[PDB]
């Protein structure tokens, strides 16, 4: 019967909630009391990338820590060179409505998607020297909000149809579909080992997925509104979420709880992007206050601020080697902070 | 070095293509279209010429791009901000929906649902300045419907006859009263005319007005 299972279901939430309190031995704020602080983190705009004629919504570094991609509503996908600020490629898109980007780990491919419900994959290394579109993954029914390549053949995408999918680029069919989200999925982050990925949705929850099985291992709650960005801790045993509650939270996969919340009474706008430092000591979060904060990720003390954009900071990524942090914004400018 | 130089030359050639494309996109006119499922937005689109559908048409040497975003069926709170800076928001409402009710909801009128969507759009933080063209379609079917059915079914309070001229006018004024940004945006309401093909001309006139009165803003002559 409905009521049997429902009253049963709300009981299963109890053992989950019951055990989580029992494993809440001590607050991270108590454990990290004696770590000497990080000190003022002064970061200045080193490079400023100009050439976009609309708001930027997405950017992704390369594994080589030098090239990067950006997309905007102008319907152009540009591969930048961060060292020399010169454009390597400008990809015209068929659909001006792009909301995400990904640069393949090998650097051979780049993917973008948005309200057109399609994840288009563009081939960079091409005999005829003109980035050509390779495959169009059309199996979603809502706007794509994120996409992250695993290999040059596997790409995982998250959409507004409340589902994530893992694709096979050669065939163009969904190898697996991840369902379980009760709200619109906003962002996904792949683990360092590329075996797991967490997704954040508009239903104020984040779910840890297994890419192989296609089942959700754990689900984390604690936020009060939409989760707009998500990223793992470098060691893959933790991740952090940015929501419209203007709080960032650090969840643990082993302990299955929440560790920190990075709130300041001064901050009232919604987080648009989050990203970590190579050492995991800094949590950089791009807010809608038009600025971007840098949190001490083990003390929860806002040490540092990167205020340089006119409009909201849409995307924010750090390099693999951690030499730089680049932020995009709706003011049409990407700034490389070091 | 030499290769670096040729790289810069490449990057400049790239950019001069980004501007040339930027200046081609700026000439195009971006209309966002919204409304109910049966509004007649489908019928409006046909007169003018899954995911987000685009229609391109040219009228009197002006280029229009109409973004029928009716197929998204997701949370508008996350992707509506993508269209901030459209010239206009066309809004279609079917006048023949005053006595009905949606097949999905229990007893909320289709016309009352149209207002609820209009209230959230005209007062959306992303379209504080954006002008709204409001098309009211199916005016002839509304004439037949009103002649025999009362208007009290939708608006409980109404001082006025069951005459098309007055019946319609109550609705038009009722829709125009939704906006609290009376001093910022202009709602150009039109009654759909099938044969005249003036629905497209009214869009031309309403667009120029939003352009002319914007041009006078940035040069300070206003």
């Amino acid at each position: 019967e409905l009521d049997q299972l429902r009253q049963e279901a709300e009981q299963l939430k109890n053992q989950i909630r019951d055990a989580r309190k029992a494993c809440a031995d001590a607050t991270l704020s108590q454990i990290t009391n004696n770590i000497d602080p990080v000190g003022r983190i002064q970061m200045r705009t080193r490079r400023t990338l100009r050439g976009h004629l609309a708001k930027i919504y997405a950017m992704h570094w390369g594994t080589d820590s030098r090239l990067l991609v950006s997309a905007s509503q102008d319907g152009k996908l540009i591969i930048w060179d961060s060292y020399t600020t010169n454009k390597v490629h400008a990809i015209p898109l068929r659909s001006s409505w792009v909301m995400t980007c990904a640069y393949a780990p090998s650097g051979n491919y780049v993917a973008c998607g948005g309200l057109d419900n399609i994840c288009s994959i563009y081939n960079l290394k091409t005999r005829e020297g003109n980035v050509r579109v390779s495959r169009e993954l059309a199996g979603h029914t809502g706007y794509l909000s994120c996409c992250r390549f695993l290999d040059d053949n596997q790409i995982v995408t998250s959409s507004g149809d409340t589902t994530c999918a893992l694709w096979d680029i050669e065939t163009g069919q969904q190898t697996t579909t991840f369902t379980g989200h009760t709200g619109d999925v906003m962002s996904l982050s792949l683990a360092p080992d590329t075996r797991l990925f967490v997704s954040g949705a508009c239903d104020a929850s984040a779910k840890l997925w297994d890419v192989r099985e296609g089942m959700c291992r754990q689900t984390f709650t604690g936020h009060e509104s939409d989760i707009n960005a998500i990223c793992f801790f470098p060691n893959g045993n933790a991740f952090a979420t940015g929501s419209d509650d203007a709080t960032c939270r650090l969840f643990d996969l082993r302990a299955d709880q929440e560790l920190m919340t990075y709130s300041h009474d001064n901050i009232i706008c919604g987080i648009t992007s989050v990203s970590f430092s190579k050492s995991g000591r800094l949590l950089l979060a791009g807010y809608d206050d038009f600025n971007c904060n840098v949190w001490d990720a083990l003390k929860a003390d806002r040490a540092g601020v990167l205020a340089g954009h006119d409009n909201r900071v849409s995307c924010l990524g750090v390099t693999d080697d951690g030499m730089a942090v680049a932020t995009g914004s709706w003011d049409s400018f990407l700034k490389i902070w070091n | 070095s030499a290769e670096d130089k040729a790289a810069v030359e490449r990057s400049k050639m790239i950019d001069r293509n980004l501007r040339e494309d930027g200046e081609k996109a700026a000439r195009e006119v971006k209309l966002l279209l919204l409304g109910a499922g049966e509004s007649g937005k489908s019928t409006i689109v046909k007169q003018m010429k899954t995911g987000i559908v685009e229609t391109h048409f040219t009228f009197k040497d002006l280029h229009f791009k109409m973004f029928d975003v009716g197929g998204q069926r997701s949370e508008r709170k996350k992707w509506i901000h993508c269209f901030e800076g459209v010239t206009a928001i066309i809004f279609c409402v079917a006048l023949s929906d005053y006595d009905l009710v949606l097949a999905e909801d229990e007893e909320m009128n289709r016309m009352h649902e149209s207002m609820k969507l209009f209230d959230s759009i005209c007062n959306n933080k992303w379209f504080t300045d954006t002008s709204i063209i409001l098309f009211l379609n199916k005016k002839d079917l509304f004439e037949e419907k009103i002649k025999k059915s009362p208007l009290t079914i939708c608006y409980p309070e109404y001082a006025g006859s069951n005459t098309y001229e007055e019946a319609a006018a109550y609705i038009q004024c009722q829709f125009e009263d939704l906006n609290k940004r009376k001093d910022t945006k202009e709602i150009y309401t039109h009654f759909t005319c099938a044969t005249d093909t003036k629905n497209v001309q009214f869009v031309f006139d309403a667009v120029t007005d939003v352009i002319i009165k914007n041009n006078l803003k940035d040069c300070g002559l206003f």
Partner: single-chain antibody, 232 residues
Framework: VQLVESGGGLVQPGGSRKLSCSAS????????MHWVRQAPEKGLEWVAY????????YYADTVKGRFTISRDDPKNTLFLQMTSLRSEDTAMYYC??????????????WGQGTTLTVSSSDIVMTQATSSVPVTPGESVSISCRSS???????????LYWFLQRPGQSPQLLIY???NLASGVPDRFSGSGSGTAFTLTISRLEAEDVGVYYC?????????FGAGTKLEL
């Protein structure tokens, strides 16, 4: 992706002839083209270059102000206008394409070239090996020497390598030291620093017998090296 050139043949000295190279099957408009000539018995020698959209035209010392190089992007053709031909302009004129952007492989594709026979400050690259005998299945190293440190500040040692099999157009093997071209087996490798350069082949075959060349790209006018023929 073929490149074919038209013209050549026999001309009395002082005459003016035109060479046209019709690109087909790639984005010609976005490729920087060169021209490289090879004498009837001697090695390669750079002559001209045009950047993308005719933004930058360079020339060699021996042809400066004597040759005019032009492109027709709409028709995907490349032109060379030659004036007052001298006896030392007898060579096979290859047409090469190259694109310069971070991580690209310039001089990757070479045309078949045309034969032209007239009737009758520079980096200098030296490789002092010729007609080296080698047997298939053994390991061979080819050494090259420069007069100047090719290692630029940014870390790019603008030294290239090429292989010209008997009766074929030259083929890129290494586009910068410690880099490997497209379509070339893993056997070829190159390691060097500053002015000393080497090309190591682990195991070879009868397919890769022929003459090897070295080129620098640190600065124009892109002087090449002498040949290094593998003997078998």
């Amino acid at each position: 992706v073929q490149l074919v050139e038209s013209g050549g043949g026999l001309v009395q000295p002082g005459g003016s002839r035109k060479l046209s190279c019709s690109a087909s099957g790639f984005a010609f408009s976005s490729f920087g083209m060169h021209w490289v000539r090879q004498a009837p018995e001697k090695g390669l020698e750079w002559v001209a270059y045009i950047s993308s959209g005719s933004g930058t035209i360079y020339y060699a010392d021996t042809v400066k102000g004597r040759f005019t190089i032009s492109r027709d992007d709409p028709k995907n053709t490349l032109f060379l206008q030659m004036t007052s031909l001298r006896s030392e302009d007898t060579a096979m004129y290859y047409c090469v394409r190259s694109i310069y952007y971070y991580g690209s492989s310039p001089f990757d594709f070479w045309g078949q070239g045309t034969t032209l026979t007239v009737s009758s400050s520079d980096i200098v690259m030296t490789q002092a090996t010729s007609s080296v005998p080698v047997t298939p299945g053994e390991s061979v190293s080819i050494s090259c020497r420069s007069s100047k440190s090719l290692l630029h500040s940014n870390g790019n040692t603008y030294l290239y390598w090429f292989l010209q099999r008997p009766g074929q157009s030259p083929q890129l093997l290494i586009y910068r030291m410690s880099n490997l071209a497209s379509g070339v087996p893993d056997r070829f490798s190159g390691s060097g620093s500053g002015t000393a350069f080497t090309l190591t082949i682990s195991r070879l075959e009868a397919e890769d017998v022929g003459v090897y060349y070295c080129m620098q790209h640190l600065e124009y006018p892109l002087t090449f090296g002498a040949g290094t023929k593998l003997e078998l």
